[PDB]
Amino acid sequence: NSSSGTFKALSAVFKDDPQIQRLLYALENGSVLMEEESNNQRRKTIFVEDFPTDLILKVMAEVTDLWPLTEFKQDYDQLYHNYEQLSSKLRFIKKEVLLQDDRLKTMSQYH
């Protein structure tokens, strides 16, 4: 109830998916006191960085959608370009390195 209108609007327009809502709550106070899914039910804190980078990028993209002013739009353009350049280059690196480490495994069985 005490959250500012920004996070309130973001949560309202976002789906009721627990993942996105917990990400918003963690962003609002650093981390999310989420309820453990294990049978030993308990509360544990999870940091924002534990959430996937794609969801945070989508959140900030929505923020720039609702606040499309030129500085914010340019900042999102630069940060999304850095996303699809650095992290996506790292992503082909990661997928191809899982493939190439599987090649290493096949080699190790080979010799």
Binding site: G30, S31, T45, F47, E49
Partner: protein, 50 residues
């Protein structure tokens, strides 16, 4: 008045423990960052040796 003073003192205790918890959460995020940085630096050194 005594109960109001108790409420005020317990709210002061709430604020003190909340500051302690904020420090603990900052230290936990710092510990996560330090773990990441330190293990990646050690990975870099060990991989260079390899």
């Amino acid at each position: 008045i005594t109960l109001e003073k108790d409420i005020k003192n317990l709210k002061h205790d709430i604020n003190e423990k909340t500051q302690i918890n904020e420090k603990l959460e900052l230290e936990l995020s710092e510990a996560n960052s330090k773990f990441e940085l330190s293990k990646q630096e050690n990975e870099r050194l060990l991989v260079a040796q390899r």
